Amino acid sequence: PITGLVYDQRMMLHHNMWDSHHPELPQRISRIFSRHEELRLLSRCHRIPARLATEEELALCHSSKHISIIKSSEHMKPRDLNRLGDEYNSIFISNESYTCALLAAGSCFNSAQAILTGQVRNAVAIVRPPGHHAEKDTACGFCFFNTAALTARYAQSITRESLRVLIVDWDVHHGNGTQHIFEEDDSVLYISLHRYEDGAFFPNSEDANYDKVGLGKGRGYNVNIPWNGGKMGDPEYMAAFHHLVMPIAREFAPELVLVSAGFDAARGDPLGGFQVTPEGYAHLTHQLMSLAAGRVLIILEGGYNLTSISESMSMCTSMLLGDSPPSLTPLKTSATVSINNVLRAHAPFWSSLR
C-alpha cells in the first residue's frame, strides 16, 4: 500500500532560448514538486529514481531516424536548433532537450517497473517535456518522444505482449501520437477527453473526432471524447467518466492504467480555457484507482498555470495515497451532444454502453 513518486530537477534544463516566457517552463515540474513538499505528501511517498531511457527502449514506439535526429540536437549551435525545431509543429529545442526527454521516459519506466514488481501500488511522475503529441516518426506540440506510449510498451516488454494497458488522456489536447501508435492494437485501450471545436483546437485534426474508434483488430479500442462549444468543467468531466470512461474501462479490465495527466483543462489555464478544479482531478483519480487492482501511474503531460497544475497534481497524489476524496450543475448542451455521439460510436463494441 505504497505510492511511488519520481521527480528529477535535471528535467528543468530543457528550455526555450529565444522565448524564456514560453508556457512549457522548466518551473512547471519544480513548482509541482515544491507543492508536494508543502502539503507533506512527498514524505509519504516512496521516491523512485529517474533514469535515461535507452535508444532501444525509444525504438519500442519511434523510428530510428526520429531518435537519431533528436539525438543530433545535443551539440547543435542555436541557429541549427532553431531550424530543426521549425521542422515540426510547435517545438523548441535546446542542447539539453534530448536528455530531458530520455529522463522523462526512463522515469516512467522505473515507475511502471515499481508497480509491476509490487514495490509500490501506484505512482506519480513529475516529468517534462511532455509526450502525447509525439508520433512514431516526428516531434510535435512540445513533445519529443511519447512517454506514455513507450511506458505501455515497456510494461508489455517485462510482462507479456498482450498485457492490457488502459491509457486515460485527460490533458485538454488530443494525444494524436498515442492514438496513432496504438490505433490497430487491442492490448492498449486509448481513451482521450479533449477540446476539439470541430478541428479549431490544437492539434487541428479530425483524427480527434468521436468517430475514430480504432482500426482493424484495434476497432473499439480508441475512444475520443471531443468537446465543442467553449468552457467545460467538473460536471462535464464527471459525466464523461460516469457514462463512458469507467463503463468501458471496467469492461476492458486493464492490468495497468496510465494517465496522460495534463493539467491544462484546469481552471486558470491560459491555453485550455476550461474549468476543471483540483477536487475534480481528485475525483477522476479516485475513480481510476478502482481499476487494475489499483495499478495506476499518473504521468504529467501539459498544464501551464503553475499554481493550478501544482494544486491539481498534488490532489491526485493525495488520492493515490488513499486520502478521502474532497467534496465537489447540469451539463452544457454541447457536452451532452458529445457524450451521446461517443455512446453511439462505441455501443457496437462495448456491451456496457447498451
Ligand X SMILES: O=C(NCCc1cc(C(=O)NO)no1)c1ccc(Cl)c(Cl)c1
Q: 171 or 236, CB closer to K ion?
A: 171
Residues in region 211-270 near ligand X by CB under 6 A: 262, 264
194 binds K ion (CB under 5 A): yes
Applying CB under 6 A, the site for ligand X has a residue count of 14
Q: How far is the CB of 290 from ligand X (least distance, A)?
A: 26
Please, what sign has the CA dihedral across residues 310, 188, 322, 44?
Answer: negative
State residue 4 phi and psi, 5-degree precision: -85, 155
Q: 169 or 311, CB closer to K ion?
A: 169
DSSP string, 214-231: --GGGTT-EEEEEE-SS-
Which residue has the closest beta carbon to Zn ion? Answer: 302
15 binds K ion (CB under 5 A): no
Has 133 been annotated as catalytic? yes
Show Cβ contacts of residue 148 under 8 Å, excluding neighbours closer than 6 positions. 108, 131, 132, 167, 169, 175, 178, 258, 260, 299, 301
Residues in region 210-239 near K ion by CB under 5 A: 218, 221-222
180 binds Zn ion (CB under 5 A): no
Show Cβ contacts of residue 167 under 8 Å, excluding neighbours closer than 6 positions. 148, 149, 152, 175, 178, 182, 188, 189, 190, 191, 257, 258, 259, 260
Report whether 182 belongs to an annotated binding site: yes
Alpha helices in 227-351 (DSSP H): 234-240, 246-252, 278-288, 306-320, 333-346
| Of the candidate residues 182, 196, 202, 252, the single one contacting ligand X (CB under 6 A) | 202
23 binds ligand X (CB under 6 A): yes
Report whether 173 belongs to an annotated binding site: yes
Q: 23 or 294, CB closer to ligand X?
A: 23
Cell numbers for 58: 525509444
Q: 220 or 302, CB closer to Zn ion?
A: 302
182 binds K ion (CB under 5 A): yes
> Is the CB of residue 319 less than 8 Å from the CB of residue 259?
no
33 binds K ion (CB under 5 A): no
| Binding pattern for the stretch 141-180 against K ion, x by CB under 5 A and - elsewhere | ----------------------------x-x---------
Report whether 71 belongs to an annotated binding site: no
| Of the candidate residues 63, 82, 90, 209, the single one contacting ligand X (CB under 6 A) | 90
Please state, in angstroms and rounded to a whole number, the distance separating the CA atoms of residues 131 and 126: 12
At 94 the three-state DSSP class reads coil
Nearest residue to 139 (alpha-carbon basis) of 188, 86, 74, 186: 86
Nearest residue to 227 (alpha-carbon basis) of 334, 151, 124: 334
| Binding pattern for the stretch 212-251 against Zn ion, x by CB under 5 A and - elsewhere | ----------------------------------------
Q: Which amino acid is at 174?
A: H
- 90's contact among Zn ion, ligand X, K ion, none, with CB below 5 to 8 A by partner kind, is ligand X
Q: How far is the CB of 348 from K ion (least distance, A)?
A: 16
Helices (H) and strands (E) in the chain, counts: 12, 8
Q: 15 or 173, CB closer to Zn ion?
A: 173
Q: How far is the CB of 84 from K ion (least distance, A)?
A: 27
Cell numbers for 12: 528543468
Q: Which amino acid is at 233?
A: G
Residues in contact with Zn ion by CB under 5 A are 171, 173, 262, 264, 302
Report the binding-site residues for Zn(2+).
Answer: 169, 171, 173, 178, 182, 188, 193, 212, 260, 264, 346
Active site residues: 133
